[PDB]
Design a protein around this ligand. Structure first.
Ligand SMILES: [Co+2]
Ligand SMILES: [Co+2]
Ligand SMILES: [Co+2]
Ligand SMILES: [O-]
Ligand SMILES: [Zn+2]
Ligand SMILES: [Zn+2]
Ligand SMILES: [Zn+2]
Lengths: 331, 331, 331
């Protein structure tokens, strides 16, 4: 699963421009699905099996990123975040744009005091991107207004942990791909690789409309609060297993689905942990609100450094999540 | 109505765990409804009558509460709010958990100065719950992560006012139950006792999907701004009658429905008042946004001390609201 | 001892209005004392035994509470604390008055911003009580200026701990009652159930005047600093035994009395702990200052959440305190 995670996390797919990730997922799934379709927003919907119970597994294919909002007379670019990227994570960083351009992020400040003030209350209004242009006309040919970019950052193994950009949520995508590669479903299994989660759960608010699901399980990251002075009210930690989300700020998981998964994990000796997240949301909200309501839950991968260019997971948690879903859904 | 209000407000039903309330409502409605169903999120839908016009009356069955998010080595619990609970309403209060456990809420602060600082900017990060455990393992067996709780508070009559927890929205549940118990409907009357209003209108955003309603009327509490130095821009007061909601922050009521109700009130000499609420929302928003749009309004019970353990209503307003709905919807 | 603690902690007795508590104590002591008197301030003084050494055991019968200071045109009350009640412990709470009236505590604030300002610097000037009255005349008939109240809160066992209002100092009263029920005194034992400790040690500043005591031991609560981020400079804890008070802000205990009790505890294998308290005072100061000076000490019950409606003690500490006093004073 290491090379699948490397390929998915390094692929380009900020919210709204997820094509490249979608096509990689399809190539990994061919031979392991019975059919697929792509809807009008770009959600990829795959299926395997013909059981009477119908289940969605959802992971989002978009990552946070930036979009160019303006260009000045010297060729520098101004940007707007795409999803929840902190300007502090961009200082001194490089951005890779959809067309392959690399840009360097710099900060304004006409005096040393101004620079101190700006970093104290950093905002995207004080950042700019340098793509090497020498004029506005040159920059507009290179990377015009509306161009999307992501962190220029890739995958590395760090003493047994995996680190990359976009673990949120290419790690959930990898989980679902591996489930389809291995499972003999007892259900009709739908895999939804949904768009634009980071800008408001857009894809998953419609992807279930045309899927006759009885249940929906979102796979996403959660806060691994096991670093120095981490968030004290979060219990989730690396190597504690899949985290069964009781609640975050966007949904309360179905009690029945959580109980089913707890029963599966205890029966098959899969380590797991319970999750309450005090901020944030996942695509389970979109399925709950679809049509007459699809009962939904989230199973989370504990992740350190979420929304940074160096998100970190423990591979044993990812393998245990795959095992849990196969045991819950497979024949 | 008094014993119905006592039973409903004292029942256990924080958002996501409303089963106890749903079951009491079904028992009270036996002999007064033509049929019912429970959907996949837990919304209870009941119906009576067969008229051409189809009307939903909605009340939410959830109350605000707390959920356990972590446990420390000495057996103390940390919590997260479920809905809009202020940490100031929890200090020195007791919490009743689903499994019957009682816990005492305490506040951190290693010096007298830290305690003063903490109460000035109180947050859930500075609260803990003591359930009498002496270790992490004892507490995990007693009240683990993901356990839900509500105020340990019950019903009392205060010189002719009624005071309890969860008037929001067990008083609206009581209104609708009493309408079904009394009414000979001229409409097809659907009663929706919906889940998870306090965590984002979840239940009512789907309960209408499978109900062919021409109108929906939510019954919920509103701010009785008749206490000392109450919110000056709110006009609503106890004993002013049902409050007809023109607007709050989640919906504008249908003008036609409001006009219909005003006509009924004037024809039958029912006291009523108009409402504009400068914060907050109700399930009318969910029905308005269902399918091609269900025209919706809210009729509110004036309530003092909303989201405290001592919410207060005037029984005459409750009786007038029942009268208004029976006159509007009955033969 | 459980039912005695339940009855004493639930009884009504704010400072100045302790009659009901005094009457319960006198009834419990019937058959176990040789005589008693009630002095002009209301202190109850009892005695048993005939030995040469005369020892006072003191506990105060008052608890903190509130008193009505004014009534407005709409029947709402304003209050003043009786003793050290924090306004933060009153928000959303109910008050039980001497005549049985229940009132609900609310807070002023004409805008959402004013409400936020008010809770950041809460004072009794921003609180009011609602007793259900609709006019000043009605409220003055129900609960006029000068009416006293206490928390509407009662006793509950929480996994082997006892929780109630007024552990301070009904637990000390229970200790001394149980000593008198069991002891065969080697001293002449005087029991003083003093009034008005919480408003300045008033009762115990005079109850010793007419008692020819050689020693005085006050029994009162102290801070059990074993909760999350408790007061770091307090060592006392639940289940560490009676706490022998070296000093607090009102007195330094007699070194000879503390040494006597330590010798007893070691001889009879009774668990105990030493106390230094960085704020607060007890009735030991009143006996120390009586006439030519009565050597005095305090033995404290570790208590969590002091001056809240949910004070918490460990029953084993209370039993050990009774044992200690019987071994020290009895045949
Ligand atoms: Co994200
Ligand atoms: Co509410
Ligand atoms: Co005190
Ligand atoms: O996310
Ligand atoms: Zn995500
Ligand atoms: Zn409500
Ligand atoms: Zn005391």
């Amino acid at each position: 699963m290491k090379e699948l995670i490397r390929k998915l996390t390094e692929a380009f797919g900020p919210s709204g421009r997820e094509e490249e990730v979608r096509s990689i997922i399809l190539e990994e799934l061919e031979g392991h699905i019975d059919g697929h379709r792509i809807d009008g927003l770009g959600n990829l919907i795959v299926w395997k099996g013909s059981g009477e119970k119908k289940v969605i597994l959802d992971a989002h294919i978009d990552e946070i990123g930036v979009v160019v909002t303006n260009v000045d007379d010297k060729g520098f670019l101004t940007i707007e975040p795409v999803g929840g990227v902190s300007p502090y994570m961009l200082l001194g960083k490089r951005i890779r744009f959809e067309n392959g351009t690399i840009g360097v992020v710099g900060m304004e400040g006409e005096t040393t005091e101004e620079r101190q003030e700006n970093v104290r209350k950093l905002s995207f209004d004080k950042l700019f991107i340098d793509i090497g242009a020498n004029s506005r006309e040159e920059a507009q040919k290179m990377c015009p207004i509306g161009s999307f970019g992501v962190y220029d950052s890739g995958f590395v193994e760090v003493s047994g942990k995996y680190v990359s950009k976009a673990m949120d949520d290419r790690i959930g995508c990898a989980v679902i791909v591996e489930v389809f590669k291995r499972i003999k479903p007892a259900v009709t299994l739908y895999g939804v690789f949904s768009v634009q989660e980071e800008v408001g759960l857009v894809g998953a608010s419609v992807a279930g409309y045309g899927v006759p699901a009885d249940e929906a399980i979102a796979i996403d990251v959660t806060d691994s609060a096991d670093t120095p002075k981490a968030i004290k009210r979060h219990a989730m930690r690396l190597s504690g297993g899949p985290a069964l989300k009781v609640k975050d700020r966007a949904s309360i998981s179905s009690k029945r689905i959580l109980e089913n998964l707890i029963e599966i994990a205890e029966k098959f000796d899969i380590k797991y942990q319970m999750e309450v997240l005090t901020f944030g949301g996942t695509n389970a909200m979109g399925y709950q609100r679809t049509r007459e309501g699809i009962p939904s839950a989230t199973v989370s991968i504990p992740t350190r450094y979420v929304h940074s260019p160096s998100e970190m997971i423990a591979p044993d948690d990812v393998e245990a999540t795959v095992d849990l879903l196969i045991r819950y859904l497979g024949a």
